[model samples]
Target chain A: SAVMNVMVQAAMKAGRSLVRDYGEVQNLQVSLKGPADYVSQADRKAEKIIFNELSKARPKFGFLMEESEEIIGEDSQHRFIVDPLDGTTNFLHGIPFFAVSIALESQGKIVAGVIYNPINDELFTAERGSGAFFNDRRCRVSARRRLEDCVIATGMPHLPGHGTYLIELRNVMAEVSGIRRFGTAALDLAYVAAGRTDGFWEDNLQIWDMAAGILMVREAGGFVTDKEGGNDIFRKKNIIAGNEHIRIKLERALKKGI
Target chain B: SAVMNVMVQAAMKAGRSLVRDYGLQVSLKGPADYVSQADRKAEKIIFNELSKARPKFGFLMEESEEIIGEDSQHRFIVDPLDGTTNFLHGIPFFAVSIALESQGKIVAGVIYNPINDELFTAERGSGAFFNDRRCRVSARRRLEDCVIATGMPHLPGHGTYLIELRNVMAEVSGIRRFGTAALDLAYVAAGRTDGFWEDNLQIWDMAAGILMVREAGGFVTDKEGGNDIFRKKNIIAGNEHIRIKLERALKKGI
Candidate 1:
């Protein structure tokens, strides 16, 4: 519970900052980095708040904040991966579905995770052995086992100058009950934890974007690993996560050589 | 103003019924048909409500509730076009969007796109607002950092669909098609979805939604950034973050 408290405090603090910036998106200063790469001063502001707060609390712990490059700590045993604003695009567009994500990786294993959506006031937290909780209520994956009854979330990789990923999408769309692309990886994982979605997978994601969510899903009795069925999710750019059965089925569905 | 009251009353009354039906969705008797009939019945109720309020107001309703009132200058336009796709799909993402256009000007508009039970209302000069709370444009000022919504052309095997999909996918964080244009535009106004673009929309589909977005401190222009949206039959709505970015993306290699 102490670890959860730390994660919750850090996530909520970051979430508050995001909420403030989100409320005034029109008046906030903005800039573009590349064709599809956007960085907001608000994002940096939230990341700074989170980095300072967490580092001050545990100075020895390393950090992986979204804006700045990774910070490897001397302790090496504990590191916090943080996404101060996971759905920057959504936030910029005035969509209220963005969140602040934080996860503590202890000796290569995620032990704690937290995701907070300030606009909806929905907080999701999980500890390695303890089950996942949504707004303080224990949550579980949906009991519906049939693929036809499932509601799945996925990230569509469509960047300017990026190659097409439709072949993979077509394979999954043919079998899933329904598909949703919410534009926020952190929230997609949280939805799986809350049973709002049955499963999820995507490629070309950074560690900060998915580290917190992967832990939350695992803590909630869900299965999570890299696309190749390995635990090195952070090292690999691909992710596939879901309940026991859904995870296996999703991985199988994604097994095309192309 | 009188026409606005009638339209709002009809939409609110129907929206309340929708909320009640939505609550009972999981355990209700005959879920699919029940909801479908409920939608049709709601359209009928709005039809009767509006007809009684303005018997001579010509009607352009979505759900077979057609009435051509004698007065051409004061016709009531409505879209009982419930987001039936979302409702039947159990997405909990549907809405009832309404607008009152009088003599070529939208006097008032009401969009009750009930995801979280929030209501968005706007009138011509009164300054657009939401659920009694003052709404404004987002301060975000970048394109890649913005989330934009778009509608996929329904024709499954079409070249336009593939091209638009390819164009939009390559430029945004994500693309969403909620299967309803009214709610999509209403979301732009409510700041739920930053910007929305879709082609081939009917007048009844966007008349109310466009006003709501503009009233809420956002901008809505045609794909060419022109005011002739209805004529072009294409629209892009958003705050500053996405408006220009989307326009450029849409124009890429054109």
Candidate 2:
């Protein structure tokens, strides 16, 4: 609980910085590259705040952050994985779906996670043994079993496998009630944890991008794994997250595409 | 701006009711049909408010039969709750859309999203506003720098729509499907997203959004680059160049 509190505090501190920058983003919308530059600054500043707060609280804990090189702390067993701005493009575009994601890893296992969307003021927190919480209220995955009754969130592919991704999108879109691409993987997993969306999947994500979210989903009674139903999400950088039935169903649909 | 004033009043009133009902829907494990109740309630509130404001204007709404007034040339197109699926699923991305049409042309429009208390308003000659601040489309010229929004076509039309999506996704820097067509269009008008395209839409679904984009110095047309959006039930919208590019992309072979 102490570690979770530290993560929450760090995320909120970073979130305030992001919210301020997000307001400024609206004013810079007309400038093609101005918003992106401003967002980059905001990203680094938030990550700095998180790094400082976490370091002060647990001086020996290492850090794996989006804005800088990894800090391998004296205590190798504990590390803080952070994405100060998980949806940079969305933030730069003035979309209010970005988040500050922070996860605590204890000896390679995610033990605590915190995701805060400042614009919406929704905070999703989870602990390994405890359950997930949405703005302090207990939450879990959607109970909808039928894929056709579910609303799934996902990311569009940007790699050379674009052709393969389209096939997957086409296959998944057909069987689901709705296909949403909010362009934020961290919040997508938090949405699944909160039951806002039934499931989510994405490709080419960094560890910080999904570290917190993965814990949130698992703690919320949902299943998360690499695309092939393996536990090598960190190495593969691909993920599928959903409730027991929906996760498997989604994986099969994605596999069927190939 | 009297018509705009009336539309805003009705939209705000209906939005308040929706916000309350939306909270209730989330806190309880109610029946699946409860969302219909909220939709009907919001629609009734808007209809009553609008009917009181303009007795002679006809009405076109999503929940009930069309009402033809004595002044056949003037009517109000309303989607009391756009992004109904999002609201039903507790996603906080729905809106109350209202547009005033005269002689089959949209003259004024308003879209209210209660969750964020954001109100998008526009009139034909005047410009678009986001919560009272003037809004405009983004200035991104290259497709590779744009973040495009689209509606995912349901079952029967998925085959053709996927090809169009593929063509567009190949060029755009990012893709988004927010599940609220009206709000999606409003995002384009406000420069939140660079462009939008969708098919199989109804009049009430996009009438207000269409005006909002045009008033914001953007463009909106049918998939064929014509102004037959209402008749064709499809739309392509963005800044002038992006909309044109989007139209071209939509027609490209897979």
Candidate 3:
């Protein structure tokens, strides 16, 4: 419970920053770092808020922040992984779906997590044994059994790289009830935590995006692992998560194309 | 100005009812029929509200409710037009987009496009606004990471479909088809969503949405990157980042 409070405080602080920047996106002067690498002063500002709040709460803990790389701590037993602004594009576009995510890795296992969407004021939180909660209300994955009765979220890689995934998408689309491509992976995980979606999968993501969500799903009585069904998800760069039944079905659907 | 208020009131009132129905959508209580009747009933209520408020304002309405006003100088164009497909699909993404055309020029518009509780409003030359706050386009200046919104043209034209799909897919981070252009433009205005393109839209479908986007401080051009949006019947909109990128992508290999 102490760890949950710390994660919530850090994520909420960052979420507040995102809300402010979102209100003035059009007038705020922004710079581009690379094709898809955007670094708004707001992003830096939020990351600073989260970094300071998280580090101050757990002085010796290390950090893995989105804006900067990793900050290894003297207390290697505990580390905080953060995505200060999980859906930067959505935030920039005023989509109201972005979030601040924080996950605590305790001795190599994610023990606590929190994701806050300031625009909607929905906070999703989870501890290893405690159940996931959406705005403090207990949540669970949907009970829809068949693919046709399910709504799924997926990630699509950018141009010149999404060909193989697109084929898989076509296959999944034909079978599943609906597909949503909301731009943020972190929030997609939270959606699963809230049972708004039945399953989610994506490739080419970092630890900050998946860590909090993975734990949230697991705590919400769902299943999660890397695409290869390994426990070493941080090293895999890919994740597939859902309720127990859907996870197996989704993984099977994805592998069918290969 | 008076006409704009009537339209806003009518749209807001209808939106409230839609919101109430939306809450019950998850239950299996014949939601499709309920939503359809609700949509038609809302259109009727809007027609009555507009007719009683102005009486002489001519009408070009979506739900087949038309009144030829005695006052020829002004006409109130409206879309009691709900996206029935979206509503029946239980998407929670629909809106009431309205415009006032005076002497053949749209002078005032209000889009109560309520998915995220956004209310977009505008008056010609007075600038556009959303929820009483001034809006503007995003400053992101790249295509690769830009999240672009679009409508999938389910019409019967292979050449047009293939070209549009190929062009859009070759760039941008992702593509979304939310099924309602009015709500899409409102998202662009509020900065919760950015950049939208679509073809085969009726004037009633986009006139209000386009004004909302521009008023929110964004640029809107035809598919060819020009002001001939209404005539060309193709629209692309966004802040500075994806506008130019979208134009280039649409024209690429054409």
Candidate 4:
């Protein structure tokens, strides 16, 4: 309870800071390093807010962050996995779909997690062995088990892997109800957990992007695993998540690419 | 001014009704048919609001309602509910798109998303505005450093755009396909997206959107890189430079 409370406060504070910087993008700053450099600064500030609040709440916890606040603490069993701003490109473009994601790991297991999207004010929270919540609504994955009638979410690589991703896209698009590329992996997984989308998969993503989201999906009574249906998501840097039926179907579609 | 005023009013009124229907998607009588009913209701509201203001205007709208009037020189084109699939799926990305055509030239346009209350409006020789603030295309020139919005045609019998999609996506920074063409176009005009392209669309889908992009200081043409978009039923739009680059990429191997 205490850990969850502190994480929420830190995420909300950081989210407030992010909302300010996002609004200022329209005004166009004349920075010598350009607007992207300015967004990185806003990102760093949010990480600091989270780091300070989390460190104050539990004085000696380890940290792994986007801009890693590598403050290893005396408590070896506890650490915070954080992505203060998960949708960096979307934020830079003023799309308003980014979020702050924080996950608590105890004994190498994700015990609790939280995702806060300030613009939409949608907060998704989960505790291991408990349940996932969307704005405390007790959200669950969609009941649709058929791929022919499912709206799926996906991510495109910002730089490379166009061939690999597109091959998978072409295969999946032919079977699914629709294909969506919404540009935010953290939110993509969250949407799957909330039943806004039936399933999701992405390649070459970082741990911070899917850490909180993985637990949220499982707690929401869904399933999450690597492309091989193994628990090596972080090791493989790929994940596919959905309700039980969609997860299996999506994995088959992804691996059965051209 | 009168045409823009009438169009905006109609779009907002219809947007409210669509919002109400979208909010009830989960509890609908029938998911697929409920969306169509809501769209038809929006179409009627917009048609009534516009025809009341300009009694002599003709109409070509979605839901297969085409009301050609006595005024041969002027007509209205509308997609009172664009992105119905996204709307039915609970995505707040759709819009009410309306336009006026005077002697085959688009004169005024408005695309409204009441969910976010974003109003993108434009008139010929008058610049575009997003929420009443003047909007302009981005100054970014490099395709490698841009985000491009795109449409993916998934309906039956439409599969020719995939090769073109892969080609253009390979050249840009990112590809965005949220299924809302009108709002996607409005975002292009606002500089939120650098460029956009899609094939196999109707006039109502592109009429208002193409006009908005042009009024925001952007360029738009058909797949053949010409101004025959109204007749060709395909579109590629962006700032002058990006439009050319995207056009070339989209046309490669097609």
DockQ scores of the candidates: 0.29, 0.46, 0.27, 0.41
Q: What tens-digit string does per-residue lDDT give for candidate 2 at A68-93?
A: 88999999899999999888889888
Candidate 3: misplaced stretches above 4 Å?
A: A26-33, A228-232, A256-258, B16-52, B55-95, B100-108, B113-117, B123-127, B133-146, B153-166, B173-180, B189-194, B199-207, B211-235, B238-248, B251-254
Best by TM-score: 2
Judge candidate 2 at residue B147 and give its lDDT: 91
Alpha-carbon deviation at B33 in model 3, angstroms: 11
Q: Where's the lowest-lDDT run of ten residues in candidate 1 chain B?
A: B25-34
lDDT of 4 by residue, B101-158 (tens): 9998989989998887889999998999999999988778888778898877541423
Model 2, position B180, has a per-residue lDDT of 89
- What lDDT does model 1 reach? 0.74
With candidate 2 superimposed using the best TM-score fit, by how many Å does residue A246's alpha carbon deviate from the native? 0.7
Q: Tens-digit lDDT track for model 2 on B1-254?
A: 78788899999999999899877343222322124677888899999999998999999998789999889989999999998778887898899999999997999999999998899999988999999999999888988788999998643578788888888878877889999889999999999999999988889889999999999999999989999998899999999999989888898884
Instruction: Judge candidate 1 at residue A232 and give its lDDT.
Output: 77
- The DockQ value obtained for model 4 is 0.41
Stretches of model 2 off by over 4 angstroms after superposition: A26-39, B24-35
Q: Please say which candidate is ahead in lDDT: 2 or 3.
A: 2
Better model by DockQ: candidate 3 vs candidate 4: 4
Per-residue lDDT tens digits of candidate 3, residues B108-181? 88787555677788888767777877766555576665567776433134355446656676676556655577
lDDT of predicted model 4: 0.83
TM-score of 4: 0.92
Residue B74 error, candidate 1, Å: 6.7
